[PDB]
NAD_synthase domain-containing protein
Amino acid sequence: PMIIMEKGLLEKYNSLLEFFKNKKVIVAYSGGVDSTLISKIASDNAQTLAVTIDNGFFSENVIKKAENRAKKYNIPQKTIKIDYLNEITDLENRCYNCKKRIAEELKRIKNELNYDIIVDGTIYDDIFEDRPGIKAFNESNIISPLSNLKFSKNDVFELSNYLKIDIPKKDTCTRIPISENMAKSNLAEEFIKLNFHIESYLVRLENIAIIELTKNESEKIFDNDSIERINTELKKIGFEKVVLDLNFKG
Amino acid sequence: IMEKGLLEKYNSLLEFFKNKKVIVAYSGGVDSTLISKIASDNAQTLAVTIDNGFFSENVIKKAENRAKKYNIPQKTIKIDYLNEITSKDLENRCYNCKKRIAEELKRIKNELNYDIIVDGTIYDDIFEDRPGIKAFNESNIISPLSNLKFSKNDVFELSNYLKIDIPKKDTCMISKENMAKSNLAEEFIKLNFHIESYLRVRYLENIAIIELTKNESEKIFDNDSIERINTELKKIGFVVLDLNF
Ligand SMILES: Nc1ncnc2c1ncn2[C@@H]1O[C@H](COP(=O)(O)OP(=O)(O)NP(=O)(O)O)[C@@H](O)[C@H]1O
Ligand SMILES: Nc1ncnc2c1ncn2[C@@H]1O[C@H](COP(=O)(O)OP(=O)(O)NP(=O)(O)O)[C@@H](O)[C@H]1O
């Protein structure tokens, strides 16, 4: 080994090295950190083409940055345009259908170019979240090696740094109280107070319920049952997320 | 409008727009849709969307379709801003970039011999740090929602009273210091509490949002863990746990 890194990450990296060997690899490339990492590893070790599908959901600035970032790392890259907007397909089934249309090109591109595999930049952390398009890519036989090797996001950052891939800066363009929300707050307090016998002092932003409380009550909510009930019911009041302050007051 | 406060703001807008030719800096978002619709119902109005390459086609199309839906006259003007190197600070890149939009809006106002340019900045916005607000002011672009002290709730309420739909979430939908802070928080909790499975630390406004699976959740439940995790994730300078596992 030419880099010294933790054995866990080194095994994952080595698995990637062997997997790409002697393959012609189409990489589904979005320009982000995750798909940049695997594009660079593939291109350093195999005949590789990073393919960006421009379906109208990425601005020119984002597309240009992805192209310049591939050139910077000597990753062969092409941007292929589809007019997906004019071919519409449902309620968020757009996610699956939008991603499926991206998956369907690339599979066309892989067959036209007689390449061997398509890989993407989906990581292990991603498959625990609600991302419908992961199904859509699997249905086109697009492999997620970072997910197969159980890459966390931390593993992506560390491996990127070892391979001297810069984390891209933010476009952005920082810091971000009325009362309906006083009503939601109080009813959330009243609900938990009445149901968990939370006599002691205890719900605070952007429709997110921030709960504060003391240690003695804290042992009561630890059972998942409570949390499952507390998360659904404080969302019935319309809070989109329920969250608990780990700063237990005196 | 069941509220006199909101009724007064609305009436102030109607009175100000009467008999004026109004250019609206229109992005398709809730705020500039609200003032475009009020201008458009009460005055000769043109909603202008500047396509500078930082908005996707989908966003442009949705703004155009949203204008058509509410009978707001609308035009998308494309500029090739990306080809111009004029700024190099993240606050001067914003400022100079927004200046380029403002300058295009001012060109259109003079060419069409219109009277005023208004935008959708609200009162809440001016307390946050957004560089381009300076740039629009320097082109004499007015912020009526800010001048009348619209909060975010006032916009939502007035929109509902005027039957403007609040747009749904976009399909399938961050500095280096905060990526770094988050990453160190994950590393800390994973290594210390044997969180083999999924663990992530989301950051909003320097607040640590911890995410994890049900099976791992049993590990952190004891007060001891939370006391240590709350102090140490503040050592990084951020602490709260998302109850939706
Ligand atoms: N327009 C696109 N063209 C090509 N590949 C794409 C495109 N959009 C997404 N992908 C791929 O699909 C993967 C998963 O999509 P997504 O759920 O949006 O993850 P992601 O957060 O964008 N990953 P990344 O941006 O590379 O760090 C990405 O890592 C890319 O490999
Ligand atoms: N591309 C654009 N073309 C025309 N006007 C624009 C454009 N982008 C922004 N504006 C105007 O500038 C105002 C303030 O900019 P900004 O705060 O970035 O937009 P925004 O849509 O209000 N985002 P947000 O306040 O977070 O909802 C908008 O309300 C619009 O009136």
Notes: The first strand of chain A starts at residue 24 and ends at 28. Chain A is about 45% helix and 10% strand. Chain A touches chain B through 55 residues (CB under 8 Å). The longest helix of chain A spans residues 93-113.
